[model samples]
Target chain A: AMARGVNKVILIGNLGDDPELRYTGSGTAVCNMSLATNETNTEWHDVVAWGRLGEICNEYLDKGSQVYFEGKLQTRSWEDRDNNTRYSTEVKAQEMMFL
Target chain B: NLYFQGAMARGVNKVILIGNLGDDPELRYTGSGTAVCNMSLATNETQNTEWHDVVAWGRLGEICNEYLDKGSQVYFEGKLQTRSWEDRDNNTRYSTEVKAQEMMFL
Candidate 1:
């Protein structure tokens, strides 16, 4: 059997737009933005970052800020009032750098 | 608001690029058995498009600085980062960068 490690994530790209920030009741901050990473064949990726890095993103980064992100891919599930399940995936960023 | 369900997929992020090294690679070693290297790569989209910046670390960084040079064509893979710090004047500043995990010589 092949050994498997825990899940984690990281990404680098230019900001597609300024980060959007919001605060929860507990005061935890979340930031959302779209990033464009070029692929070998000229494809692009859209990734999201969250947490302290999110605050940094909202306060400083503008569209076209070159960024390096470290985070974990997170999938969340919840039941809506209508009794339906919803899902989303985002990178829970831990460390970040601007260049 | 959006919600997602299923196995949370977290792994080394994926980045792809065709670019030229803006400068030589800088290598450093951490106290642990790990090594850290950094460099800047300029990726162009078109004659008029703004260039992008890509940064690499660990073995990936070593590979780039050793084999790449200013204006050399290369491909890179990494993740986006937004970091904060205080400048000489003590004001807060933030920036974003690409933290490469894997890269190809192409």
Candidate 2:
């Protein structure tokens, strides 16, 4: 009964730009990238990868690079400088395959 | 040819979820008599649980309302749609949802 639910996402698309790497003060590596998927109209998704997977994404992905992605949907909430609450939705990478 | 192929292959956006219903479905009909069903599904992550708004249509929507109940387990697939609207103050708000294309009992 525990661990009974799954929230997953899959996409095959071209990268909108090269991956960018950044690190927390604790030195945890995080990578971020944009994906463009063209279904009805083109939909853009923000993708995040962590640790070694993050490094791999940074190393292999470039603008217009095609890849397959398996990830989980996530949203982060925070307050902006204007004191307004902001929410950002992203896909956290579980697996990625270059095409 | 290359542009068309890239568009065809690179354009895929889909979501898959397996979860349990939080309550009985809300079944309704369109003016044209199209069946529609709505439910809240709870999917647990490592920590807190995530509740998603799920929607189904047509005969499938009818089947959902018929057989699924509170705490029923289901697997569903669909695409992500983000709805944007304005409140009375004209403040912009956004809600992302899954529009069920297919589903199954588990």
Candidate 3:
């Protein structure tokens, strides 16, 4: 994998549900939201927002809410319960604008 | 696991990628005489790199084929598309690709 190139992604879509918000041990806010994009066909995306950017999601968004999102593409790998390595891709939201 | 159904929201679904080409672009003319160019791009993050299939059409495709090469860096703006077909063995495979619209040489 080339680690020096750019890995950016931008999306404008609607929320599938309410934002899932949580706090870190240090009390920093993080939010996870489901976004759907239909360009010829529909695809679902997992978006993660951090810090104050995330705070706005839980405060003002709900199902069917739309947003203009800009973020970087990140794929994380983890071992499942069966010891199989699983991969999940997400958009680490850098800018979140409600529409 | 909730999925969105009903009519798709009339929303934007665009993508922006900046990366280097993995291979020199392949250019050809379609039956309608439309220029089509295809290439693979490599974009990196903290831990790894993702290869994206990019397609360009019309004059943009011609320009890409003429100027871009393997390892050429560029910025691509496009939309995502998922298409599928059945193999000879009756197995259906899906391919999601980026349909490039605007580009900036970098």
Looking at model 1 chain A, report the run of 10 residues with the lowest lDDT sum. Answer: A41-50
TM-score of 2: 0.48
The deviation in Å at residue B67 for candidate 2 is 1.0
Estimated TM-score for each candidate: 0.43, 0.48, 0.47
Model 2: CAPRI class: incorrect
DockQ agreement of candidate 1 with the native complex: 0.02
lDDT of 3 by residue, B1-106 (tens): 7766866678897999999998888775432345657778899989798888888776777888999999999999888876443333446546567878777888
The Cα error of candidate 3 at residue B97, in Å, is 0.6
What is candidate 1's lDDT per residue for A23-95, written digit by digit as tens? Answer: 3323345566666676664323334444455677788888889888776666533333354554545565666
Note the DockQ of each predicted structure. Answer: 0.02, 0.01, 0.01
Tens-digit lDDT string for candidate 2 (B1-106): 2453442465787889999998888775432345657777889888788888777766777889999999999999876776443333436545566767778988
**Shift in Å, residue B60, candidate 1:** 1.9
Write down the lDDT that model 3 would get: 0.75
Alpha carbon deviation, residue A32, candidate 1 (Å): 31
lDDT of 1: 0.59
